[PDB]
Write a protein that holds these residues in place. Structure first.
Motif, PDB file in Angstrom:
ATOM      1  N   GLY A 367      -1.245 -29.633 -16.503  1.00  0.00           N
ATOM      2  CA  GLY A 367      -0.729 -28.299 -16.749  1.00  0.00           C
ATOM      3  C   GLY A 367      -0.309 -28.051 -18.183  1.00  0.00           C
ATOM      4  O   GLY A 367       0.280 -28.915 -18.830  1.00  0.00           O
ATOM      5  N   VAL A 368      -0.610 -26.853 -18.676  1.00  0.00           N
ATOM      6  CA  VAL A 368      -0.285 -26.480 -20.046  1.00  0.00           C
ATOM      7  C   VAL A 368       0.698 -25.310 -20.068  1.00  0.00           C
ATOM      8  O   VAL A 368       0.684 -24.473 -19.166  1.00  0.00           O
ATOM      9  N   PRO A 369       1.567 -25.248 -21.093  1.00  0.00           N
ATOM     10  CA  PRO A 369       1.698 -26.199 -22.204  1.00  0.00           C
ATOM     11  C   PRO A 369       2.326 -27.529 -21.793  1.00  0.00           C
ATOM     12  O   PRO A 369       3.161 -27.572 -20.890  1.00  0.00           O
ATOM     13  N   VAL A 370       1.909 -28.603 -22.453  1.00  0.00           N
ATOM     14  CA  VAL A 370       2.439 -29.928 -22.174  1.00  0.00           C
ATOM     15  C   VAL A 370       3.850 -30.051 -22.740  1.00  0.00           C
ATOM     16  O   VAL A 370       4.105 -29.675 -23.882  1.00  0.00           O
ATOM     17  N   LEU A 371       4.765 -30.571 -21.930  1.00  0.00           N
ATOM     18  CA  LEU A 371       6.170 -30.649 -22.313  1.00  0.00           C
ATOM     19  C   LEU A 371       6.539 -32.030 -22.837  1.00  0.00           C
ATOM     20  O   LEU A 371       6.234 -33.045 -22.208  1.00  0.00           O
ATOM     21  N   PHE A 372       7.206 -32.066 -23.986  1.00  0.00           N
ATOM     22  CA  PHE A 372       7.596 -33.333 -24.592  1.00  0.00           C
ATOM     23  C   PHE A 372       9.097 -33.417 -24.844  1.00  0.00           C
ATOM     24  O   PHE A 372       9.739 -32.431 -25.209  1.00  0.00           O
ATOM     25  N   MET A 373       9.642 -34.612 -24.641  1.00  0.00           N
ATOM     26  CA  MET A 373      11.050 -34.885 -24.883  1.00  0.00           C
ATOM     27  C   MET A 373      11.171 -36.059 -25.849  1.00  0.00           C
ATOM     28  O   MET A 373      10.813 -37.188 -25.510  1.00  0.00           O
ATOM     29  N   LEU A 374      11.659 -35.790 -27.057  1.00  0.00           N
ATOM     30  CA  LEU A 374      11.807 -36.836 -28.065  1.00  0.00           C
ATOM     31  C   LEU A 374      13.153 -37.537 -27.942  1.00  0.00           C
ATOM     32  O   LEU A 374      14.182 -37.011 -28.370  1.00  0.00           O
ATOM     33  N   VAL A 375      13.141 -38.727 -27.353  1.00  0.00           N
ATOM     34  CA  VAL A 375      14.348 -39.535 -27.238  1.00  0.00           C
ATOM     35  C   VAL A 375      14.629 -40.245 -28.562  1.00  0.00           C
ATOM     36  O   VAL A 375      14.339 -41.430 -28.717  1.00  0.00           O
ATOM     37  N   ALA A 376      15.191 -39.508 -29.516  1.00  0.00           N
ATOM     38  CA  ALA A 376      15.405 -40.027 -30.865  1.00  0.00           C
ATOM     39  C   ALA A 376      16.711 -40.808 -30.994  1.00  0.00           C
ATOM     40  O   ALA A 376      17.635 -40.625 -30.201  1.00  0.00           O
ATOM     41  N   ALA A 377      16.763 -41.685 -31.995  1.00  0.00           N
ATOM     42  CA  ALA A 377      17.950 -42.482 -32.320  1.00  0.00           C
ATOM     43  C   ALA A 377      18.405 -43.393 -31.175  1.00  0.00           C
ATOM     44  O   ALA A 377      19.547 -43.853 -31.158  1.00  0.00           O
TER      45      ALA A 377
END
Ligand SMILES: [Mg+2]
Length: 1047
Positions: A367-377
């Motif tokens: 499914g679009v839009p593709v969802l991203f989660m940046l687990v930073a630090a």
């Protein structure tokens, strides 16, 4: 122009809940008092749950946690003295505390001044952070206070020493306020713990609600297991210590409670469930990681988003979980069959690698839009499958993270920007790499703990789509009012508020859940269904003369089918045997609302009742819900024997001949979709539908067919015959006369009351017309006695030329059709009968000839200013009827020829005060200036309008609403907080639009927001001043009057 969408993460996997009302210190004497084995087990259980051993030298403020110690349940020389030293006295085998501490008659308070005496800003923070962790709260003053009737706050010797060294006077202040020294023992510092962390279903629901009303669009949920939940009973303490892993675990029974509740209270909220196996790596391939991904509630809706990580998650701090490929394949397969969109939790660089290569195609297909989660630090490992050696696979490499952490502590603005540059430079390759391999994708950012100061600046620099906050990521929140600038977060909503206000500073807006569902392509079924009708009718004109109900119904055929299937599910549920009293209606109502069907309360609902003349129209709620059930169960074949229990009430039974056909019930459903209430009337949902280009035209077409089918049903009933033409009525001091052919009434009367929707020419309509008129005159008359009142009430025509009856749907079609009118050219016959006998005389010169149907058959420019100020009240459909009078005036005014500019002078001699405008105010039109007072929870008026000013968003107005929902009593409520917004039309029209207005019902809720009584009752004093000035006025102009009121 730049907007973010905020994700709220209330629960998480790591932080734990710490009860404020639990002892935070245990004297060694109390533990040493136990038998050796029990003492050993108790201590190691305490130490496992965060309790650290600590020497003497610490201070405590305790009251109300004492309990007798019977030694028979288990003396010692070493212990005996310690007990008496800590204020205990023996009495055989029983010890008790005769030592007394200061009670909590008045709440303990550590003033901001007292705190600021300390030199170290670092010391102050940890003091604030410790106390706020224990349940202490910051005040508006900036001080710390304790509100509960018990207290047990302890500070370590480390705190006491540093406090004494920095400033001994501050430490002395605690001593004079009940604090005292302690011996050795154990204490709970509450590391990685919070008194605000929700680990129960009800707590999680509440925390989500708080975050959503603060501006969050997405809620990221976890659950915690309670399989090892236990309590430690410490001697001498009347409160046990709660022990337990509070392990991150997918609890199905919790989601079985959380999800339907959230679907009811927060219909538009995007729900994002965690599929993480953190805390249990051995269950990485368990089907439990998708067991909570199903259809919930009666509406059978699934969670919109679930966590998905293409690769192993290995924390450097320890723990994590693996994500095998066969497993992830089963996940995506299940995700699709249920309707769930994966959110890629980007923990590692390996996650990125697997996402833009091997999982690139399957993720797009998901499914679009593709969802991203940046687990930073968050420090991550990569493990070589052969050797086992670990490398740094973190998005921000450990050296750079450690660097950034130092610059954050520096506190200077220069170290901040260098910290932002460090974070952005490290993350930018990952962001670009994701967007280069995913043409349609959304990317969000989270930052753990201290790094949250970078959260906004880094997200802007990387031009990200979303920002995530919550107790999962951090337990603190920045507060400039607090000494040290930081304190414990009072829930995720606290942090969402901080983020929203932070973005508001920079001119960055936020995206609500409802809007985001459009962007992400996950709109709600009912919203989609309404847009389906809008499209099916897109090519039809809103003019009733150019389209028939048959054609409209024919175009909605597949939608009627879609609606029917919903009705089957509601019928079958009602046929699942219940109740005996008239409170059975409550069962039906709740069943209806949960399926999305709103059983509206129609004022003219009695027309379907045969014995309507022998019924009291006050108790019409209980029977209409009973008949509704009958109306759904009868055609399908179900038994209504449980119903017709209305016989045990005070027939209210509706004859079968008056049952609504399937398409009729469908039209009623469709027009009820925009501006819905939630389950407990706490909020208004589906607000976005009004902003559609074809909204009004669609609603006009719907109510057209809704009218044709209702009138057809009305003609086969003993519904009271209505009369042709309007009824004019004067109210003095209340007095009541009914003029027929007198224009003298207009000149003698202070105000004119324009008719509403149900105020038509028939027995019930006249009663209602008199009622609203009387309500309006008690209102203005009450203002007269403050720092011969005559009123004119107008009643609508009940029958039109062709003998067609005038009902509610007739007025609403006219309402919406007027909205869809680009030029000032549309008006109805009902508007004509009122206009020509009220407004037309102001245009011509002296009496003319009027027809038998009370219809009709020059300039005097010098006397245009000589016309008396026509002050009018408007409610519901009033503003629609009024603007239709302006149109006809322009047509006759142009026929007579008034140069337009003189037409403006004409409308300057009239004035309008609208309460609950259920129709749009065409600002650019030539017409009467209006003061508009419309409530946010006036869903009927909301559904009838398209103005954005009526919609309340997270802000000051939203704060007042949330405050009044709990603390404020209904009768006392006044919308003082309302803010007038001033508008000037292209052709001179002026509109005073009040914003933030809402009406409390009897339960301090948002239902019954169309009450003209509540509109006038809850009217603020400063608004009365406006009306008072209108009343006590010479032959002044309208434009001059309100232009003065702007100051
Ligand atoms: Mg998570």
């Amino acid at each position: 122009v730049k907007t973010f969408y905020i994700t709220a993460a209330p629960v998480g996997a790591v932080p734990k809940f710490l009860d404020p009302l639990e002892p935070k210190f245990i004297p060694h004497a109390l533990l040493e008092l136990l038998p050796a084995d029990r003492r050993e087990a108790t201590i190691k259980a305490l130490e496992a749950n965060g309790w650290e051993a600590v020497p003497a030298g610490g201070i405590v403020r305790e009251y109300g946690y004492d309990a007798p110690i019977d030694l028979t349940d288990y003396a010692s020389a070493t212990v005996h003295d310690a007990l008496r030293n800590n204020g205990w006295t023996p009495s055989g085998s029983v010890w008790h505390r005769t030592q007394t501490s200061p009670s909590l008659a008045q709440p303990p308070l550590i003033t901001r001044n007292t705190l600021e005496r300390l030199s170290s800003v670092d010391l102050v923070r940890q003091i604030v952070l410790q106390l706020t962790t224990f349940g202490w709260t910051a005040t508006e003053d900036g001080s710390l206070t304790w509100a509960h009737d018990r207290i047990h706050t302890y500070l370590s010797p480390d705190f006491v020493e540093r406090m004494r060294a920095d400033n001994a006077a501050v430490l002395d202040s605690l001593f004079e306020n009940g604090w005292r020294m302690c011996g050795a023992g154990h204490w709970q510092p509450g590391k990685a713990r919070s008194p605000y962390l929700p680990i129960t279903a009800n707590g999680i629901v509440d925390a989500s609600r708080e975050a959503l009303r603060e501006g969050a669009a997405v809620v990221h949920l976890h659950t915690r297991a309670t399989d090892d939940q236990a309590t430690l009973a410490i001697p001498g303490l009347n409160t046990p210590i709660g022990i337990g892993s509070q392990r991150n675990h997918i609890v199905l029974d919790d989601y079985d409670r959380i999800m339907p509740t959230l679907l009811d209270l927060e219909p538009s909220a995007i729900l994002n469930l965690s599929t993480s196996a953190r805390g249990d790596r051995r269950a990485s391939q368990s089907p439990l990681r998708r067991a909570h991904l199903k259809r919930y509630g009666h509406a059978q809706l699934a969670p919109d988003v679930a966590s998905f990580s293409p690769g192993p998650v290995v924390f450097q701090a320890g723990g994590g979980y693996d994500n095998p490929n066969a497993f992830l394949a089963d996940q995506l397969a299940h995700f699709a069959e249920v309707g769930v969109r994966p959110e890629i939790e980007v923990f590692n660089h390996t996650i990125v690698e697997n996402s833009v290569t091997l999982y690139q195609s399957p993720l797009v297909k998901a499914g679009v839009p593709v969802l991203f989660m940046l687990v930073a630090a968050v420090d991550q490992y990569h493990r070589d499958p052969v050797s086992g050696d670990t490398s740094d696979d973190s998005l921000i490499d450990v050296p750079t993270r450690k660097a950034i952490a130092k610059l954050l502590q520096a506190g200077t603005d220069d170290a901040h920007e260098k910290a932002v540059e460090l974070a952005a430079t490290q993350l930018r390759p990952t962001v670009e790499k994701l967007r280069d391999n995913f043409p349609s994708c959304k990317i969000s950012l989270l930052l753990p703990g201290p790094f949250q100061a970078l959260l906004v600046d880094v997200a802007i620099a990387l031009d990200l789509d979303g920002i995530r906050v919550g107790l999962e990521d951090a337990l603190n929140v920045f507060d400039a009012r607090v000494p040290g600038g930081v304190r414990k977060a009072c829930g995720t909503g606290d942090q969402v508020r901080w983020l929203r206000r932070e973005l508001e500073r920079r001119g960055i807006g936020i995206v609500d859940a409802e809007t985001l569902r459009d962007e992400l392509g996950m709109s709600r079924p009912d919203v989609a269904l309404f847009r389906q009708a809008e499209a099916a009718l897109a090519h039809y004109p809103a003019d009733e003369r150019l389209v028939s109900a048959d054609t409209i119904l024919d175009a909605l055929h597949p939608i009627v089918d879609t609606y029917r299937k919903i009705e089957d599910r509601l019928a079958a549920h009602l046929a699942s045997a219940p109740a005996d009293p008239a409170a059975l209606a409550e069962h039906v109502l709740t069943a209806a609302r949960s399926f999305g069907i709103t059983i509206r309360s129609f004022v003219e609902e009695l027309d379907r009742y045969e014995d309507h003349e022998y019924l009291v129209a006050r108790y019409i709620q209980i029977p209409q819900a009973l008949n509704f059930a009958r109306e759904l169960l009868v055609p399908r074949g179900y038994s209504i024997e449980a119903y017709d229990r209305a016989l045990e009430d005070y027939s209210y039974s509706v004859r079968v001949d008056q049952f609504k056909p399937l398409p009729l019930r469908c039209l009623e459903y469709l027009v009820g979709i925009p501006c819905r209430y939630n389950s407990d009337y706490s909020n208004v949902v589906n607000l976005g539908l009004r902003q559609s280009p074809r909204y009004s035209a669609t609603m006009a077409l719907l109510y057209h067919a809704l009218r044709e089918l209702t009138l057809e049903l009305r003609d086969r009933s003993n519904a009271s015959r209505k009369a042709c033409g309007p009824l004019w009525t004067v109210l003095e001091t209340r007095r009541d006369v009914a003029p027929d052919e007198l224009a003298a009434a207009i000149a003698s009367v202070d105000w004119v009351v324009l008719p509403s929707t149900p105020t038509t020419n028939y027995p019930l309509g006249i009663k209602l017309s008199n009622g609203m008129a009387q309500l309006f005159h008690g209102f203005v008359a009450q203002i007269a006695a403050d720092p011969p009142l005559r009123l004119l009430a107008i009643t609508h025509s009940g029958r039109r030329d062709d003998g067609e009856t005038v009902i509610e749907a007739s007025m609403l079609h006219n309402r919406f059709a007027l909205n869809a009118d680009p030029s000032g050219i549309y008006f109805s016959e009902e508007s004509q009968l009122i206009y020509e006998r009220l407004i037309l005389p102001r245009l011509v010169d002296k009496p003319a000839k009027l027809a038998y149907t009370e219809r009709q058959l020059r300039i005097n420019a010098e006397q245009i200013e000589r016309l008396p100020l026509l002050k009018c009240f408007a409610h519901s459909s009033g503003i629609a009827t009024a603007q239709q009078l302006d149109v006809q005036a322009c047509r006759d005014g142009e026929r007579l020829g008034l140069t337009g500019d003189e037409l403006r002078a004409f409308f300057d001699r009239a004035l309008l005060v609208s309460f609950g405008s259920a129709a749009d105010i065409h600002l650019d039109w030539l017409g009467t200036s209006v003061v508009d007072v419309t409530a946010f929870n006036d869903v009927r008026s909301l559904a009838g309008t398209t103005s954005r000013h009526y919609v309340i968003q997270p802000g000051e107005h939203a704060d007042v609403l949330q405050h009044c929902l709990v603390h404020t009593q209904p009768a006392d409520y006044r919308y003082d907080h309302a803010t007038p917004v001033w508008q000037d039309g292209r052709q001179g029209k002026i509109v005073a639009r009040l914003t933030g207005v809402f009406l409390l019902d009897d339960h301090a809720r948002l239902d019954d927001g169309h009450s003209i009584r509540r509109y006038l009752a809850a009217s603020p004093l400063w608004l009365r001043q406006w009306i008072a000035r209108f009343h006590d006025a010479p032959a002044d102009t309208g434009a001059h009057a309100i232009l003065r009121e702007l100051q």
